[PDB]
Amino acid sequence: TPEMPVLENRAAQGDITAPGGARRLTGDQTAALRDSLSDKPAKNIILLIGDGMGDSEITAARNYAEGAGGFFKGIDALPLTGQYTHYALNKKTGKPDYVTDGAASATAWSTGVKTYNGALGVDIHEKDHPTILEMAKAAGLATGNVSTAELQDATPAALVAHVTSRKCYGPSATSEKCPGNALEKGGKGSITEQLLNARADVTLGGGAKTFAETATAGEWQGKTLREQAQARGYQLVSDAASLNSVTEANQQKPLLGLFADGNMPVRWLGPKATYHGNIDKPAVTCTPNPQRNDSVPTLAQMTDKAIELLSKNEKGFFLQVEGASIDKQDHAANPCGQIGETVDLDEAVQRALEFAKKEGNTLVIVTADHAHASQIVAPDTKAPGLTQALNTKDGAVMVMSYGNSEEDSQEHTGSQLRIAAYGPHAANVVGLTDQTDLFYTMKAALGLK
Template identity: 35%
Template sequence: MKKFLSFFIVLVIAVSFLAATSHIYTVAEAAPPAKNVILFIGDGMGYGHLTLGRIFKGNALTMDGFTYNGTVSTYPNDPAEKWVTDSAAAGTAIATGVKTYNAAISVDVNKKPVETILEIAQKKGKATGLVTTTRITHATPAVFAAHNADRNAENKIAVDILNHKVDVLLGGGKQHFIPKEQGGKREDDRNLITEAKKMGYTVVENKDEMLKVTEGKLLGFFKMSHLSYEMDRDPKREPSLADMTKKAIEILSKDKDGFFLMVEGGRIDHAAHTHDGAAVARDVLAFDEAVKIALDFAKDRKNTLVIVTADHETGGLSIGGYGQYNFKPEILKRQKNSIADVIASKLTPDNIKQVFSQYLGIEDLTIDEMILMLNAFKEKDKNPSAVANMCADIVSRRALLGWTSTAHTGTDVPIMAYGPYAEAFTGHIDNTDIFKLMMQAMGLDKNIKMGSLSGSLFLYPSHRIKLFWGKKESNEALTLHLHKGCVSDTDGQTYSLSNKNK
């Protein structure tokens, strides 16, 4: 009778799984929760971006070494843009487990605030941090410590983030924290940096100042807007993403209750929007170096979960394009600076050949390419990005680096994990599941509720799951074990989730 019940219950689990409905599994005895969670988000980073970074490096990425990895769907809950998300909606899904409309900052489709993983971690006494290469008020960091119906309301978002009292905030965006008369964008005359100092924050504005801080609340603004692309960064003044990640971990890890840290490589997305392959590659590698900092920290302990993912893919990047079976990375490697932020501003109709030679390493600009560039200058009044776009297009075509869009795409993105509960981040999951799995990993929620499009049962090896038959808990409760897609009962009888008795 017991074995019959065991098989029947496993059959019910399998049927429910195959029907792709939502599931709730209560873990009776689980592994110890992760004390610390470090979440990396490569904004716009798809598989093509990872491949490009690997080719540039000429060796495996740190991200390639994760044992547990999978894919993530990114679509929003938007009536007009059903399949392609922006960073706000995707970030909200990751931070709260709730899908919403594009442009929403941790509010649902009814514009009601939704609690974030950072807020929940704070309530549990954990230290928290946000690190980014974009403005700290930009969509991805904002969704963890702010609530707003419109991602563009960055002055209001700045106030919200400050009021959340996040322990470590490092990135750009000073302009949204100071009034207009001081070069900022605030129209309410508030100086949030002065207010932050009164709240106990140490405020820093360059790398050396940041490195000197060893404890307490830290607020770092290293540029008025976004930080520089990695290939444009002044290493003496502006910290790298790895530098900021290391400092954040150093400070947050002093909290006895653990910490939650989100690290964003935000300019990967910006480079992909402008089809600047060299800038994409350099920022992917900078992101990978930051991942290594966190991974080294986690490997010295057994209590830290490191997750690496993306909010969406940008650009439809492909290695090879334009109908040719080839790719020429050496062309991209000769590029000295980013096109949009540096090279385009140096171009005039009279110096095109000189700038292409000096900054892009292109000595043989063709007549057709010259005509394209001159025409771009004629369009500049109507389209300020015309010159940068044409310059990037010429470089991409020479390198055979393909692009399908200047916007985001709806393709799946990677996810990988290391540490406690890392094995849960495998197979195909939805972006809302990342929040749920982080909650589970930190022991903040005993129930796992997976998204309806998830393709895997996320129960953990060696966890014991108690399933009860009717009300006869004392007599007929069965302890089942899940391992590699199979469930076994206490007698050692094993059943696969394909309903076949092994």
């Protein structure tokens, strides 16, 4: 029944200076909560991942774009919540590695088995395990993979590739870093080659550059990975106009959208945080990114078309969407770039719920692969790292700190983080769980075996 509620408005109710004015709740949630619980099987699953979107990343984005008492229409409107752990494993010893990377974590929600950082679709012994996209496809469901990063990147790759090192993008690199994976050595092939092999119905993102390499062995040996895609019946799109034109995407006519050479461009602009930037520099106000060409589709646009095409399959669909640069910008210590991307992920989460709400059998999940560096500190702060002051929507200054790395790249962190869901089987994300339970939650919802 379309009787399961999405959080309507969790914004502050009134005057935050007045008693009860900062409240986000209007009444008791006991009933509404009872109405969100359902162990009926999910027909569809949309999994939204914001790379590096820890609770801290979620708070700074809200504080700035919607103000402290604000509310993310998408990101915050999911009724059921919990916290989950995402530690990885040390390759040699098999003990825990408290801070995972994009590859070991992505692998965990995809296969349900922990692995060492850098691995994609294999356990610590180097044995392959089937991904949820692969199991979806086998049962007859439709499949989609959407991201704002190069399709070869860890997060989207973890669903279609089984390599020993995330560096094995296309043919050349594979030969050198994943020899037992290289096609000419009789391996399954590079990440790019295994993606074309996988043949999901809809694949959208960046990474057009690796597609320029020519394979070394196999049927298409000699031909660039791009000619092969063509040669195998893939529809190729490079912009919004083209994307808007596709009316079908199935096994006979799978869709492949390559919107950028490398990663798709970020939405906002802002300088990079600096030492004492909060006390030596004026407050910043993010502005749109000039280089972002009007033709490059947005995550929400892409999520919209994907869901439109995929929902045709009467059996069902599984889709994974990732706002990839929150993390990348968090690594670069660029508050504006980071917040812009969280806002961008929120627009897509809204499209997800919209469909969810009116269909009634879609399970939607929103979370991140791990926590990151960014911190929200006081304005008078004298930090050892990189800081910047922002003018928020509250019309107040907000200071952000990056202080875990003194190298050119800010580092991930291992704190447990938020996981939120809405729909059939959402109860399984409440409480403390582990990134791997997610794999199991999905599989059970769709009734895969």
